[PDB]
Design a protein around this motif. Structure first.
Motif, PDB file in Angstrom:
ATOM      1  N   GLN A  54      11.733   2.611   8.209  1.00  0.00           N
ATOM      2  CA  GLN A  54      11.700   3.389   6.791  1.00  0.00           C
ATOM      3  C   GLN A  54      11.119   2.792   5.860  1.00  0.00           C
ATOM      4  N   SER A  55      10.857   1.453   5.774  1.00  0.00           N
ATOM      5  CA  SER A  55      10.364   0.787   4.702  1.00  0.00           C
ATOM      6  C   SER A  55       8.856   0.876   4.846  1.00  0.00           C
ATOM      7  N   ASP A  56       8.081   0.686   6.096  1.00  0.00           N
ATOM      8  CA  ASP A  56       6.656   0.892   6.267  1.00  0.00           C
ATOM      9  C   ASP A  56       6.402   2.516   5.831  1.00  0.00           C
ATOM     10  N   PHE A  57       7.133   3.222   6.284  1.00  0.00           N
ATOM     11  CA  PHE A  57       6.974   4.783   5.989  1.00  0.00           C
ATOM     12  C   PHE A  57       7.017   4.779   4.567  1.00  0.00           C
ATOM     13  N   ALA A  58       7.943   4.259   3.769  1.00  0.00           N
ATOM     14  CA  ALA A  58       7.927   4.500   2.303  1.00  0.00           C
ATOM     15  C   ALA A  58       6.738   3.639   1.579  1.00  0.00           C
ATOM     16  N   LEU A  59       6.367   2.721   2.118  1.00  0.00           N
ATOM     17  CA  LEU A  59       5.187   1.972   1.238  1.00  0.00           C
ATOM     18  C   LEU A  59       3.961   2.654   1.583  1.00  0.00           C
ATOM     19  N   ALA A  60       3.834   3.354   2.921  1.00  0.00           N
ATOM     20  CA  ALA A  60       2.814   4.109   3.136  1.00  0.00           C
ATOM     21  C   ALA A  60       2.549   5.433   2.001  1.00  0.00           C
ATOM     22  N   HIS A  61       3.779   5.969   1.739  1.00  0.00           N
ATOM     23  CA  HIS A  61       3.623   7.188   0.680  1.00  0.00           C
ATOM     24  C   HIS A  61       4.093   6.996  -0.722  1.00  0.00           C
ATOM     25  N   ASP A  62       4.460   5.799  -1.142  1.00  0.00           N
ATOM     26  CA  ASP A  62       4.902   5.712  -2.415  1.00  0.00           C
ATOM     27  C   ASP A  62       3.674   5.472  -3.497  1.00  0.00           C
ATOM     28  N   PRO A  63       3.515   5.992  -4.575  1.00  0.00           N
ATOM     29  CA  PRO A  63       2.291   5.976  -5.326  1.00  0.00           C
ATOM     30  C   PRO A  63       2.006   4.701  -5.767  1.00  0.00           C
ATOM     31  N   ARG A  64       2.612   3.503  -5.663  1.00  0.00           N
ATOM     32  CA  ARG A  64       2.500   2.308  -6.045  1.00  0.00           C
ATOM     33  C   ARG A  64       1.621   1.510  -4.993  1.00  0.00           C
ATOM     34  N   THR A  65       1.678   1.952  -3.649  1.00  0.00           N
ATOM     35  CA  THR A  65       1.179   1.412  -2.556  1.00  0.00           C
ATOM     36  C   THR A  65       0.616   2.431  -1.450  1.00  0.00           C
ATOM     37  N   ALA A  66       0.615   3.538  -1.801  1.00  0.00           N
ATOM     38  CA  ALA A  66      -0.285   4.462  -0.761  1.00  0.00           C
ATOM     39  C   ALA A  66      -1.452   4.179  -0.799  1.00  0.00           C
ATOM     40  N   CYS A  67      -2.315   3.969  -1.675  1.00  0.00           N
ATOM     41  CA  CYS A  67      -3.853   3.689  -1.671  1.00  0.00           C
ATOM     42  C   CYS A  67      -4.198   2.296  -1.042  1.00  0.00           C
ATOM     43  N   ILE A  68      -3.234   1.271  -1.092  1.00  0.00           N
ATOM     44  CA  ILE A  68      -3.427  -0.011  -0.622  1.00  0.00           C
ATOM     45  C   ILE A  68      -3.202   0.164   0.818  1.00  0.00           C
ATOM     46  N   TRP A  69      -2.325   0.760   1.109  1.00  0.00           N
ATOM     47  CA  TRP A  69      -1.967   0.875   2.899  1.00  0.00           C
ATOM     48  C   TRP A  69      -3.155   1.705   3.336  1.00  0.00           C
ATOM     49  N   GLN A  70      -3.629   2.947   2.822  1.00  0.00           N
ATOM     50  CA  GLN A  70      -4.548   3.547   3.369  1.00  0.00           C
ATOM     51  C   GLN A  70      -5.811   2.894   3.567  1.00  0.00           C
ATOM     52  N   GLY A  71      -6.144   1.800   2.705  1.00  0.00           N
ATOM     53  CA  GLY A  71      -7.648   1.098   2.596  1.00  0.00           C
ATOM     54  C   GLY A  71      -7.687  -0.139   3.444  1.00  0.00           C
ATOM     55  N   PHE A  72      -6.617  -0.333   4.243  1.00  0.00           N
ATOM     56  CA  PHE A  72      -6.747  -1.273   5.389  1.00  0.00           C
ATOM     57  C   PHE A  72      -7.061  -0.603   6.688  1.00  0.00           C
ATOM     58  N   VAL A  73      -6.977   0.743   6.655  1.00  0.00           N
ATOM     59  CA  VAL A  73      -7.368   1.789   8.041  1.00  0.00           C
ATOM     60  C   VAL A  73      -8.688   1.200   8.188  1.00  0.00           C
ATOM     61  N   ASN A  74      -8.849   0.857   9.404  1.00  0.00           N
ATOM     62  CA  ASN A  74     -10.390   0.826   9.960  1.00  0.00           C
ATOM     63  C   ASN A  74     -11.270  -0.158   8.771  1.00  0.00           C
ATOM     64  N   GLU A  75     -10.333  -1.166   8.231  1.00  0.00           N
ATOM     65  CA  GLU A  75     -10.984  -2.249   7.398  1.00  0.00           C
ATOM     66  C   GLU A  75     -10.496  -3.650   8.023  1.00  0.00           C
ATOM     67  N   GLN A  76     -10.952  -3.937   9.192  1.00  0.00           N
ATOM     68  CA  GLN A  76     -10.250  -5.063   9.693  1.00  0.00           C
ATOM     69  C   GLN A  76     -10.709  -6.448   9.119  1.00  0.00           C
ATOM     70  N   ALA A  77     -11.956  -6.905   8.660  1.00  0.00           N
ATOM     71  CA  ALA A  77     -12.140  -8.159   7.905  1.00  0.00           C
ATOM     72  C   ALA A  77     -11.379  -8.134   6.625  1.00  0.00           C
ATOM     73  N   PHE A  78     -11.452  -6.994   5.988  1.00  0.00           N
ATOM     74  CA  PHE A  78     -10.802  -6.870   4.762  1.00  0.00           C
ATOM     75  C   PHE A  78      -9.148  -7.022   4.918  1.00  0.00           C
ATOM     76  N   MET A  79      -8.514  -6.461   5.778  1.00  0.00           N
ATOM     77  CA  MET A  79      -7.505  -6.755   6.344  1.00  0.00           C
ATOM     78  C   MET A  79      -6.906  -8.405   6.567  1.00  0.00           C
ATOM     79  N   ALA A  80      -7.871  -8.738   7.535  1.00  0.00           N
ATOM     80  CA  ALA A  80      -7.436 -10.137   7.715  1.00  0.00           C
ATOM     81  C   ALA A  80      -7.706 -11.167   6.528  1.00  0.00           C
TER      82      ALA A  80
END
Ligand code: HEM
Ligand SMILES: *[C@@H]1O[C@H](CO)[C@@H](O[C@@H]2O[C@H](CO)[C@@H](O)[C@H](O)[C@H]2NC(C)=O)[C@H](O)[C@H]1NC(C)=O
Ligand SMILES: *[C@H]1O[C@H](CO)[C@@H](O)[C@H](O)[C@@H]1O
Ligand SMILES: [Ca+2]
Ligand SMILES: [Ca+2]
Ligand SMILES: [Mn+2]
Length: 357
Positions: free
Chosen positions: A240-266
């Motif tokens: 539930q916590s990962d799901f909630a972070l992926a959809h909350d307005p405070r963190t949704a754009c940061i969550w999506q911003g690591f998709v397909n962004e390996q060097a940025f994530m690491a």
């Protein structure tokens, strides 16, 4: 300095960490991003985060080895269920490699474990934390049923972490599985590549859930997009916590911003772990032994992809201001099993020492 083995290092104090890495790799990790590596990475976080600016030093000393030095206290708190395995695996190294503090052993073992995971960064490693502390109090470890407001507050109170740093640290769920959330199944992975430090968990938590890998009624769990399992190859679990972070307005754009962004994530993970690994200490008082952290396994460099049985039509998006990337989909209509073992099999029991926790 030149260490007894002939290795040239930054400082003589770093020398003892070379045979400790060799012993950890030979004895519990076997150079794999496997069960025992995963459990030690989880312990780096549960040791470090038990600290509170508001409650004061009596509540806990942070990255201080408290889990190893008081093994019958915090490991028996309900939020630490399962942490006993990593503690009992590292106490024998504390006894044998007895010029390195419990606190340094925990953080260094975390860096060595992550180096076995393709795509992970080579963490900074500062050394010199003392070998004396107190046991922390209960209530300082985030739990999967917690709200986003509660989670962000806990990380702010522990060390001033920003929401960006909090989601950055959750790249560790790219190499993570669950043994206690459901009592009927073991080793339920959080993404379809639990042995690879890639961006799949960021993608796969954004898919619509369609079922559960085990029972449908556990606290802290929500429906999974890839719930199929067979034998020891357990299906994917979603917290539930990962799901909630992926959809909350405070963190949704940061969550999506690591998709397909390996060097940025690491690189973002490295930066936040640089802060987490020194909670309870002044970093200006720890010596730099980064040069003895093993060099990490490289990734293949392939882009993130939708797993078979999933596609762009299953996405549940929550970030208005950033374009979701163009990704391919692996062929096949039904779900592929997620292997229990790094070499693809189903059978690969890790070393486990008995101990006081
Ligand atoms: C809001 C934050 C977090 C929550 C609520 C959370 C929750 C959990 C849960 C419930 C499990 C499954 C344990 C079990 O039942 O066996 C887990 C595993 C894991 N966690 Fe987290 N976690 C969070 C943050 C972190 C962070 C910051 C790290 C490290 C930087 C971390 C690394 C891991 C690892 C590596 C595992 C896998 C252990 C294994 O496969 O044996 N977690 N997490
Ligand atoms: C840090 O503290 C631990 C715990 O007191 C020390 O562990 C002991 O180490 C000796 C060998 O040096 C063993 O004979 C004992 O059995 C260990 N005690 C326990 C309770 O396991 C450790 O030596 C200390 N390390 C440093 C760097 O001071
Ligand atoms: C993994 O396995 C599934 C079937 O379980 C396939 O659909 C997929 O193409 C891959 O071979
Ligand atoms: Ca601690
Ligand atoms: Ca992964
Ligand atoms: Mn585990």
């Amino acid at each position: 300095a030149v260490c007894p083995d002939g290795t040239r290092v930054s400082h003589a104090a770093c020398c003892a960490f070379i045979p400790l890495a060799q012993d950890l790799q030979e004895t519990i990790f076997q150079n794999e991003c496997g069960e025992d590596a995963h459990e030690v990475i989880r312990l780096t976080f549960h040791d470090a985060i038990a600290i509170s600016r508001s409650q004061g030093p009596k509540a806990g000393g942070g990255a201080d080895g408290s889990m190893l030095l008081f093994p019958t206290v915090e490991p028996n708190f309900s939020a630490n269920n399962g942490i006993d395995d990593s503690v009992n695996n590292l106490i024998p190294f504390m006894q044998k490699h007895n010029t390195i503090s419990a606190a340094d052993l925990v953080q260094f073992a975390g860096a060595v474990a992550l180096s076995n995971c393709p795509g992970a960064p080579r963490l900074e490693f500062l050394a010199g934390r003392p070998n004396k502390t107190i046991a922390a109090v209960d209530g300082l470890i985030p739990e999967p049923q917690d709200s986003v407001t509660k989670i962000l507050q806990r990380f702010e109170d522990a060390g001033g972490f920003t929401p960006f740093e909090v989601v950055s640290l959750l790249a560790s769920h790219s190499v993570a599985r669950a043994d206690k959330v459901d009592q009927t199944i073991d080793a339920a992975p959080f993404d379809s590549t639990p042995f690879t430090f890639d961006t799949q968990v960021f993608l796969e938590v954004l898919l619509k859930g369609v079922g559960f890998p085990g029972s449908a009624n556990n606290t802290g769990e929500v429906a999974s997009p890839l719930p199929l399992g067979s034998g020891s190859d357990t299906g994917e679990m979603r917290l539930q916590s990962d799901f909630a972070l992926a959809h909350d307005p405070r963190t949704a754009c940061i969550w999506q911003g690591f998709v397909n962004e390996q060097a940025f994530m690491a690189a973002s993970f490295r930066a936040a772990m640089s802060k987490l690994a020194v909670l309870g200490h002044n970093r200006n008082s720890l010596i730099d032994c980064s040069d003895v952290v093993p060099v990490p396994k490289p990734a293949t460099g392939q882009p993130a992809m939708f797993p078979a049985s999933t596609g762009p039509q299953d996405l549940e998006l929550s970030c208005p201001s950033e374009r979701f990337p163009t990704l391919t989909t692996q062929p096949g209509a039904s779900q592929s099993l997620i292997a229990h073992c790094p070499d693809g099999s189903m059978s690969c029991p890790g070393v486990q020492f008995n101990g006081p926790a």
